[PDB]
């Protein structure tokens, strides 16, 4: 029950990107679910600040917050997008769109 | 009320690091408080995945989660630590201990 990568299928029409993304209709974004708490896992790759914060949160839960599970590396997808001239263009590596790694931060 | 850097003073005795950190006693870790929601701010430097996720969260709040405000860059501190030989040693740049920048991820 710790920080890891789960599935998240994102339909572009739901987020209102349909007016400038022809295809695909949906894609697999993934998301990062899971607690950042001790005992920690081997591959959350946690920062020292995350560790410190998680501990101060144990001592002072009402004041300080836990560290979050977040994407630590991202991947491109390809998209077929409406050009300002109204000409379908391909964006081969549309950066930052899918999750490669999660971690505590 | 958006993602930004607030103060967080961390006493090493509270987190149980006192047994191997002689000095300092306390330091300024900072933390990243604030919502990741729209309308966004100019300097959250948000990733496309964070933006997509925040939108899917609006449509499906019970299922998907918001994007978190997290440290995006960190700074060292210096620490005076007990060596395994029992000899105070200085760790001049103890990396990853303080927040330099926050962002939505
Ligand atoms: Cl899904
Ligand atoms: Cl466990
Ligand atoms: Cl641990
Ligand atoms: Cl670190
Ligand atoms: Cl809180
Ligand atoms: Cl472009
Ligand atoms: Cl490209
Ligand atoms: Cl290529
Ligand atoms: Cl891009
Ligand atoms: Cl404080
Ligand atoms: Cl606002
Ligand atoms: Cl915005
Ligand atoms: Cl991005
Ligand atoms: Cl949820
Ligand atoms: Cl060392
Ligand atoms: Cl050093
Ligand atoms: Cl130096
Ligand atoms: Cl280090
Ligand atoms: Na969904
Ligand atoms: Na408290
Ligand atoms: Na390629
Ligand atoms: Na405090
Ligand atoms: Na829902
Ligand atoms: Na220096």
Swiss-Prot record, chains A, B:
Record PTM text: A reversible disulfide bond can be formed between the two subunits in the homodimer; this has no effect on GDF2 activity.
Organism domain of life: Eukaryota
Organs and tissues of expression: Detected in blood plasma (at protein level).
Segments for region (Interaction with ENG): 78-92
Subcellular location: Secreted
S-S bonds: 3-69, 32-102, 36-104
Purpose: Potent circulating inhibitor of angiogenesis. Signals through the type I activin receptor ACVRL1 but not other Alks. Signaling through SMAD1 in endothelial cells requires TGF-beta coreceptor endoglin/ENG.
Disease link: Telangiectasia, hereditary hemorrhagic, 5: A multisystemic vascular dysplasia leading to dilation of permanent blood vessels and arteriovenous malformations of skin, mucosa, and viscera. The disease is characterized by recurrent epistaxis and gastro-intestinal hemorrhage. Visceral involvement includes arteriovenous malformations of the lung, liver, and brain.
Family named by the database record: Belongs to the TGF-beta family.
Quaternary structure and interacting proteins, as annotated: Homodimer; disulfide-linked. Detected in extracellular fluid as mature homodimer, and in complex with its propeptide. Interacts with ACVRL1, BMPR2 and ACVR2B with high affinity (in vitro). Identified in a complex with ACVRL1 and ACVR2B. Has ten times lower affinity for ACVR2A (in vitro). Interacts with ENG, forming a heterotetramer with a 2:2 stoichiometry. Can form a heteromeric complex with ENG and ACVRL1. Interacts with type I receptor ACVR1.
Protein name: Growth/differentiation factor 2
Gene: GDF2
């Amino acid at each position: 029950s710790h920080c890891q990568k789960t599935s998240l299928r994102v339909n572009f029409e739901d987020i209102g990107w349909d007016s400038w993304i022809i295809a695909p209709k949906e894609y697999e974004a993934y998301e990062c679910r899971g607690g950042c708490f001790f005992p920690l896992a081997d591959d959350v790759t946690p920062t020292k600040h995350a560790i410190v914060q998680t501990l101060v949160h144990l001592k002072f839960p009402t004041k300080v917050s836990k560290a979050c599970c977040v994407p630590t590396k991202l991947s491109p997808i390809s998209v077929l997008y409406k050009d300002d001239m109204g000409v379908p263009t391909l964006k081969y590596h549309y950066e930052g769109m899918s999750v490669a790694e999660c971690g505590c931060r």
